Amino acid sequence: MEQLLADYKKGNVILFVGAGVSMNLGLPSWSQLVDHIATELGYDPDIYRTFGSALELAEYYKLKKGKIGPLRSWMDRMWHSSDIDINKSKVHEYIAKANFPIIYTTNYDRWIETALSNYGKEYIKISSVSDIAKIDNNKTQIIKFHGDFDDDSSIVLDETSYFQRLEFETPLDIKFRSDVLGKSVLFIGYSLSDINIRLLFYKLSKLWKEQKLEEAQPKSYIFLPRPNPIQEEILEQWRIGMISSENDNPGESLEEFLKNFVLV
Amino acid sequence: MEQLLADYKKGNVILFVGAGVSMNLGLPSWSQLVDHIATELGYDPDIYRTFGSALELAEYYKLKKGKIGPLRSWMDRMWHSSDIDINKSKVHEYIAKANFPIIYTTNYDRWIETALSNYGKEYIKISSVSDIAKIDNNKTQIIKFHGDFDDDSSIVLDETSYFQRLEFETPLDIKFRSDVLGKSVLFIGYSLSDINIRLLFYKLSKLWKEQKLEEAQPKSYIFLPRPNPIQEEILEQWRIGMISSENDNPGESLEEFLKNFVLV
Amino acid sequence: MEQLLADYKKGNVILFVGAGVSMNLGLPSWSQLVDHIATELGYDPDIYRTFGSALELAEYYKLKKGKIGPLRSWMDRMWHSSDIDINKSKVHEYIAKANFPIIYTTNYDRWIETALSNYGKEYIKISSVSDIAKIDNNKTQIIKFHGDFDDDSSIVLDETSYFQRLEFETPLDIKFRSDVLGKSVLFIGYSLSDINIRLLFYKLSKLWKEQKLEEAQPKSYIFLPRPNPIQEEILEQWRIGMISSENDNPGESLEEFLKNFVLV
Amino acid sequence: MEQLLADYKKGNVILFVGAGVSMNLGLPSWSQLVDHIATELGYDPDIYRTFGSALELAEYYKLKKGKIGPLRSWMDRMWHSSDIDINKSKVHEYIAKANFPIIYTTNYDRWIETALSNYGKEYIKISSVSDIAKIDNNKTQIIKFHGDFDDDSSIVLDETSYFQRLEFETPLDIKFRSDVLGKSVLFIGYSLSDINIRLLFYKLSKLWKEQKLEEAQPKSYIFLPRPNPIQEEILEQWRIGMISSENDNPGESLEEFLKNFVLV
Amino acid sequence: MEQLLADYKKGNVILFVGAGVSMNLGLPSWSQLVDHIATELGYDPDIYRTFGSALELAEYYKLKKGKIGPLRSWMDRMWHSSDIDINKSKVHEYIAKANFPIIYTTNYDRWIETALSNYGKEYIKISSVSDIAKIDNNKTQIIKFHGDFDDDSSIVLDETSYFQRLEFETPLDIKFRSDVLGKSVLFIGYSLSDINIRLLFYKLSKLWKEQKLEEAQPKSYIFLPRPNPIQEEILEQWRIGMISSENDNPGESLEEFLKNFVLV
Amino acid sequence: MEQLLADYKKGNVILFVGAGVSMNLGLPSWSQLVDHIATELGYDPDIYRTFGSALELAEYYKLKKGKIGPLRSWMDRMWHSSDIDINKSKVHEYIAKANFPIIYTTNYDRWIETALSNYGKEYIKISSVSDIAKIDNNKTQIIKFHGDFDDDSSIVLDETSYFQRLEFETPLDIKFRSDVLGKSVLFIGYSLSDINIRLLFYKLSKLWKEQKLEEAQPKSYIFLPRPNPIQEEILEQWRIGMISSENDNPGESLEEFLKNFVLV
Amino acid sequence: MEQLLADYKKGNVILFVGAGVSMNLGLPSWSQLVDHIATELGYDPDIYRTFGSALELAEYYKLKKGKIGPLRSWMDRMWHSSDIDINKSKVHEYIAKANFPIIYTTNYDRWIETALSNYGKEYIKISSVSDIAKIDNNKTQIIKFHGDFDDDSSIVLDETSYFQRLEFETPLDIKFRSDVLGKSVLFIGYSLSDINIRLLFYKLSKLWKEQKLEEAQPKSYIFLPRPNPIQEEILEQWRIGMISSENDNPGESLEEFLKNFVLV
């Protein structure tokens, strides 16, 4: 809690913005993408929910249509609607105004870069290998961990693609497990039912405990608004700080936790 | 479907028994164990059930009370009660009268071995490395994949060991990865919800792809009690046949599926 | 003799029930256990009754099989048979009826706690660190000094495990050498052919003559069925008194001693 | 932090007070004691101060006088003077109004017991082996860890006695090493320059590390007036918190820390 | 010359016949292979042998030709000449008359199978996936680890192919990694100046170390004709018992070492 | 050749300094180190040179003694003598005057760092995880890939350590595998008769081929003083250019190779 | 000045040189090590000095850095500078010209070994177990008690390493506890404001008391430059004779004290 801020004033905290920071903008949820896949595939909406998880239906779309392209066009049109204003959302305001050097994200949308444009910052938005060559150390790096809408070969929308990225062998993951060296990672917007966060924590835990790294490697931190007595212990097995808030609505909890970083 | 019988008549089929072959046996469910963990941990069992999935609750009954010892002693008493009759189960009788030379099982109990013992089939139980040296090619190998109650250092009964065994490098995993070579695996009793079965299929599909084995290794199979048009193509990506039936009763479908394997 | 009853009547005595108490139950002896280890290892039982003492064969089982567990399951199955009835053993009946604050046991089986629950008493049975946290001053404490079948990491059958227990630094012996302070401890069921009993007496005598506790620590006692002239003086050199009886049959001697210890 | 109050509701926290918890009472310090030994021994204070530390001068009272008894009577005379009022001190009131079942004290005084008896709580005083037979398990066990003013043989004043008590083999030290099992220990009134303090946390960490017991035994805590990142990261290797508030003056810092322990 | 014969009496020894086992037959060396490659490529052989190692020189003729084929045909013709007879080589006789159930080999020639055919034994030679399905239990399995002349794709002659086989993911590599479980490996015909017979040892060292196989899987052994204390002490860290002989000629040394195995 | 200087002008190249870059200084070779190990271990040098490869002997020194400590002290004292000066060597001058932003080295010396400090350039030495947190991106990151003389636990002198570092999982290897993304690697000072600088090439080629990335990541390069068509055509499969000049003496070829990188 | 000269002429005196004999050498003190740690850690040195004593502050730079390597590399370079001449140091000259058979030292520098080499004597310097086998009997043994700059694992700079060395169980302390039997140990260069010369004193005192040694093992002695009757009387309980001097300069007192020892 205090150690996260002590590493933050040294510039040693990597943000890992999830999908839970955009619950106040008004983006379409995952129950709408599956609805659109059901509508344009030929099925019925509420019949195409019992048939699998939230990502293997997108995998079925990718094998029956051959591409994520017509899906990516609809998600780019619907996520980046003109109705959404980012000047009203305090979470992206405090993300942009804070001094975060690297802002790794598993979002597909371009609202973090829009928030950083809206407040004067500059970015080197990374989504593949060729964006790592254009890097610079004067401005921020927002790294689309799960691919941007500027690709069909880099969007991790599938189950096959998800299980491929769970091995951490693609060049966007070697960059992560080398950027993690010597720095803490702050996670915001995950509900701890996301399996990739758990295997990421497990991989960082064996990286720390197999190479006999001491406290020169700071651990990492996570924020979830609901305090859980058992998840603090399970995450502390993986060297993960449990930071929570007593507010009932998660929105002001995330707003205040990011307000803690916004001072300079 | 017929290719499964063509491989089975040649003795080239590995069985992989899941948890769904003992639905009619009256075994205690996955919720009464959480109720017992809650009552032995100091929680009311209606809010301890909402703290996570069953693996990350039986992991909390490993962090404090640092053993799965009393948990094993309770599940060995409750899952092998005197009210369960294995002769009244048609599925275990149909498994016992078949000609599977190697049977894998994820279950911790011993009802498959009891079913073989009550029908004259002489077996060998394999649970660790030391039992592999006691192998014999004239007896059926019951390889307890996720451990059993004859140890507490090998039961996969927590999130940490489950995510460790997802990387197939333990000796039972290597034994499975070499038993799969040149043979097909029949999976019975499995659902599809974030379990290791999909990662197993994906690993075997990678072994098919990068080693360029065209038809030397036959396609392995799964059985589902209800048909799913999504999962048939989803698993056909991973070289998996999805055998289903027309009976709405899930209990009656499995015995009618094993009846084709009984007479050989 | 009368001083032991005087320390009893103020609740300042500790029971230390051992392996020599259950001779009337009909439990398997160690001669059957080494026969089972010989059968499961591949030797001949009569060539395995030699080759070492009674504990290093179970140590060799830990060496070859790699785990206590398969042996632990057999001892749990054979020791707790349905043929053994605790209602017919008068010694366990007299142990359960007589009040005792702490009932330290060397035994692995659960027949003492079964005897206490057969006669209405309640137990807060301790075999690890985490069971000390749930301790209660109104319930009888039966502390398994050598562990029970609810753990394979605490059962002492190895000679290495025995010689590690002989240093008295695991947290099941710090509790004992703090429970000794100010109280006497009564021993029933030992023949003084075990090293740990005499070294425990030597440790308590060192604690008495080294910290100059004088007569503030009560003299503690040990029961035997056959009186010995030499061992009384050797034990009195350790401030340890021997209580014996004139009955040649050990069962009637133990029954009469515990009948003296029941009263109300 | 929050885990300490989580362990409080289960009754798993042992208080361990020191000299710094009694600085607002106004008792004589060690400097006037050194002045007393300089006056009694025929020395002069400004040459007898420089000739060593505080405890070597009590060792040089037990040397060249025959007994620590006159120094104990001096301490009983004006270390328990009539000018000191308990009721005007807030920290002793918050200690006495708390729900601590076991309280350890290295002060040789009775003002903790005076505060407990003044506010209606019942206590038992432990200073040797003979007081452990009077527990009754209903009153707050005030355990004088470093002796008391009613026994000249069990007080810890010298350097020989202090260095002998660093091996943790006395009956009070064995009692502490058994009471720590499964329970957290809260340290108050310590300046973290005390050698016994840092060897005590090293002994508890050695007990935690050698026997491989997990978080079934919780983590101990210590309160400090001023924060220190060096000591926090050093004590984190011993699984110890650094619960502290800045709050300028140290007098109200202990009161503000103890304010969380009254209505619980 | 150890407990290797005790393991061999139970049938838990896997032979790993190398390239130095057949120096008495008179097979062509790698120098004449390099000379033939130089002659067919146009280079002067005295010039060409200094242009790299033998593995890179056999990576050429796969590069600049496109196929192993003509080189495989020349090696099959020259390695199996009529001037080579098994019946005058006692080492292959002792290999054929022993009771090794699995005989791994990195040779390409068929003189091991010819030796077993000349002395009555029957073999189920394995060189790919589809021969693993043909295993008939009570037959010796000569597993060609580095391919043979019955395959142009599965042969291991290159540098790229040899570095592919160092990552143990090919099906024969998994078959070895699962055959090694619970059994010992005896290596005959290596010189330790060649790689992969140290990478096997390191991989088995991590397999027994990380999975904590406390002699569940026994030690493996190697035979060398020239004793060396440095290699014995280094191989002890990989628990490899380096067996040596005092005989000057390696042929009679290996002959006597296998004569120790040919009994019964 | 031309594309190397095309990547150089954008600052997209990485130096990988070898051990053959410093043959003109006059440092002790491995012969003197092996003779010192033989002298310290009691053997003759000429019988110790024939006992194994040059790293197995240091592995034996570490095994027979307790540490690599005195060997590291002797190597620090002998390899950094006052006779060796940077200013009379032109290769280190051309390395210091060039514009390599990241310099990798497998040398244990500091003569690269002494050359960069002598010519007024500023550098940051990286040898573990804790030095990665001091980048500041305005300084030449000299990275000791094979440890340094400022460490006794990360210096790669063994064969166990060498074969462990060949699997590319330590944090320096992860840092290299992320630094290589989108950049070219120049290899100077390697003879291509060593194993690490073939397996690294195969790892980079596997990363290029498996992820199916185009020319966004450029090709790596290597300089040797003598040309080799065999090694050129083998390296071109790994997407590697071979730079060479005839130039007779190997000392001059490196000077006229790094002359092209000076004035940029 | 006492009978230790008669013990010396029989060769029964062991030297135990500390850090106090190098006051006139001009080596950097511990305070400069604190400023170096503060400079290389980021803190202001005047701020950093007040955050604890020197030992925990040297435990930092192992915590938060991972290794003692860079600290050892700085200390070796700064403690062995060319400005220090051992020929002009007279205390080291009288130590070198004396007849001490075994010389223990808690220093890290090699100046005693350089003093022996500059005056004809030969040292067999011991820092770990592997040097104890190197003892060639008729040579002076400079056993470095607190490690050397040769290795980083065994150097004692930490608080945790200091508390490990306080419990005398590492092999160098076993060698000291056997070397002191029947001989006297003469301490020079200590001040008793430090530790280890409390338990090094108490342990031999209680060894002499508890095993009833009377005149078999002689008294052991210590020199201080400042006389103190309190410390002499305290140490005489540990059977120690302090030799003091009336000279004002601390250097000349030790100089004449060893000038006493130079004769034969």
Q: Which two tokens stand for residue E212?
A: 């904590």
Q: Which two tokens stand for residue F208?
A: 């290029």
Chain G residues within 8 A of A9 when measuring between CB atoms: none
Q: Indicate the length of chain A as a whole number.
A: 264
E28 CA to chain B: closest CA distance, Å? 31
Q: How far apart are the first and last CA of chain B?
A: 16
| Rounded distance between C-alpha atoms, residue A28 and residue A48, angstroms | 18
- Angstrom distances, CA of residue G234 to CA of D33, D63, D158, D160, G240: 19, 8, 10, 9, 9
Nearest to E162 by CA among F159, F55, F198: F198
- F65: phi > 0 → left, psi -120 to 50 → alpha, else beta; which? beta
Strand D140-144 relative to strand D102-105, pairing: parallel
The alpha-carbon radius of gyration of chain F (Å, integer) is 19
Which residue in chain E is spatially nearest to B174 when comparing CA positions? E178
A82 CA to chain D: closest CA distance, Å? 44
For chain E, the residues whose C-beta falls within 8 A of a C-beta of chain C are 213-216
Q: Tell if the CB–CB gap between B66 and D10 is shorter than 8 Å.
A: no
Which residue in chain C is spatially nearest to B152 when comparing CA positions? C152
- What is the stated resolution of the deposited model, in angstroms? 3.2
| Rounded distance between C-alpha atoms, residue D72 and residue D60, angstroms | 14
DSSP string, G1-67: --THHHHHHTT-EEEEE-SGGGTTTT---HHHHHHHHHHHHSS-HHHHHTTS-HHHHHHBTTBTTS-
Q: Which two tokens stand for residue C75?
A: 């001892």
For chain F, the residues whose C-beta falls within 8 A of a C-beta of chain E are 51-53, 56-57, 59-60, 63-64, 159-160, 163-164, 193, 195, 198-199, 202, 228-231, 233-234, 237
| Rounded distance between C-alpha atoms, residue A193 and residue D201, angstroms | 37
Note whether F156 and F54 are within 8 A (CB): no
B129 CA to chain A: closest CA distance, Å? 24
Which of D40, D57, D228, D230 would you mutate first to test chain G, the one with the most G CBs within 10 A? D230
Q: Tell if the CB–CB gap between B60 and A228 is shorter than 8 Å.
A: no
Q: Tell if the CB–CB gap between C128 and D216 is shorter than 8 Å.
A: yes
Which of C43, C61, C64 would you mutate first to test chain E, the one with the most E CBs within 10 A? C64
Q: Tell if the CB–CB gap between G67 and F129 is shorter than 8 Å.
A: no
Which of G76, G150, G154, G172 would you mutate first to test chain F, the one with the most F CBs within 10 A? G150
Chain A residues within 8 A of G66 when measuring between CB atoms: 213-214, 216
Q: Which two tokens stand for residue B174?
A: 């290597």
Chain B residues within 8 A of A231 when measuring between CB atoms: 51-52, 56
Handedness of CA G75, G81, G83, G87 (dihedral sign): positive
Q: Tell if the CB–CB gap between C64 and E215 is shorter than 8 Å.
A: yes
Chain B residues within 8 A of C66 when measuring between CB atoms: 128-130
- The residue ranges of DSSP E strands in chain F, in sequence order, are 13-17, 102-105, 123-126, 140-144, 184-188, 220-223, 240-243
Which of G34, G56, G202, G232 would you mutate first to test chain D, the one with the most D CBs within 10 A? G56
* E135: CB partners within 8 A, 6+ apart: E124, E126, E141
Q: Tell if the CB–CB gap between A6 and D229 is shorter than 8 Å.
A: yes
For chain D, the residues whose C-beta falls within 8 A of a C-beta of chain C are 10, 12, 128-133, 137, 169-171, 174-175, 177-179, 181-183, 207, 210-211, 213, 216-217
Note whether D262 and D119 are within 8 A (CB): no
Burial of C169 (0-12, 13-18, 19+ CB in 10 A): middle
E249 CA to chain F: closest CA distance, Å? 18
Chain A residues within 8 A of F175 when measuring between CB atoms: 178, 181
Which of B73, B129, B153 comes nearest C149 by C-beta? B73
Which residue bears the tokens 């009022």? D85
Which of E64, E195, E234 comes nearest F233 by C-beta? E64
Question: Cα–Cα–Cα angle for B14, B17, B21, nearest 5°?
Answer: 140
Burial of D175 (0-12, 13-18, 19+ CB in 10 A): buried
Q: Tell if the CB–CB gap between D234 and G202 is shorter than 8 Å.
A: no
DSSP annotation of B218 reads P
| Rounded distance between C-alpha atoms, residue A99 and residue A13, angstroms | 9
Residue type, D3: Q
Chain F residues within 8 A of G149 when measuring between CB atoms: 73
Which residue bears the tokens 């205390």? G91
Chain B residues within 8 A of E181 when measuring between CB atoms: 129, 132-133, 171, 174-175
Q: What count of other Cβ atoms lies within 10 Å of the Cβ of residue G12? A: 15
Q: Bridge-partner residues for E126, per DSSP?
A: E143
Which of G69, G129, G148 comes nearest F66 by C-beta? G129
| Rounded distance between C-alpha atoms, residue E18 and residue E26, angstroms | 15
DSSP string, A162-225: HHHHTT--SHHHHHHHHHTTTSEEEEES--S--HHHHHHHHHHHHHHHHTT--TTS---EEE-S
| Rounded distance between C-alpha atoms, residue F111 and residue F90, angstroms | 13
DSSP string, C171-221: TTTHHHHHHSTTSEEEEES--S--HHHHHHHHHHHHHHHHTT-TTSSPP-E
Which of E163, E199, E230 comes nearest F163 by C-beta? E199
| Rounded distance between C-alpha atoms, residue A161 and residue A152, angstroms | 12
Residue type, C210: E
D167 CA to chain A: closest CA distance, Å? 29
For chain G, the residues whose C-beta falls within 8 A of a C-beta of chain A are 62-66
* F206: CB partners within 8 A, 6+ apart: none
Q: What count of other Cβ atoms lies within 10 Å of the Cβ of residue G193? A: 8
Q: Is B222 helix (H, G, I), strand (E, B) or coil?
A: strand
Q: Tell if the CB–CB gap between D181 and C175 is shorter than 8 Å.
A: yes
Nearest to C154 by CA among C78, C58, C74, C68: C68
Q: Tell if the CB–CB gap between C216 and D182 is shorter than 8 Å.
A: no
Nearest to C69 by CA among C40, C106, C105: C40
Asked if chain E contacts chain B via 3 or more Cβ pairs within 8 Å, the reply is yes
Q: Tell if the CB–CB gap between B130 and E175 is shorter than 8 Å.
A: no
Which of F52, F228, F229 comes nearest E230 by C-beta? F52
Chain D residues within 8 A of G199 when measuring between CB atoms: 163
Chain D residues within 8 A of G198 when measuring between CB atoms: 159, 163
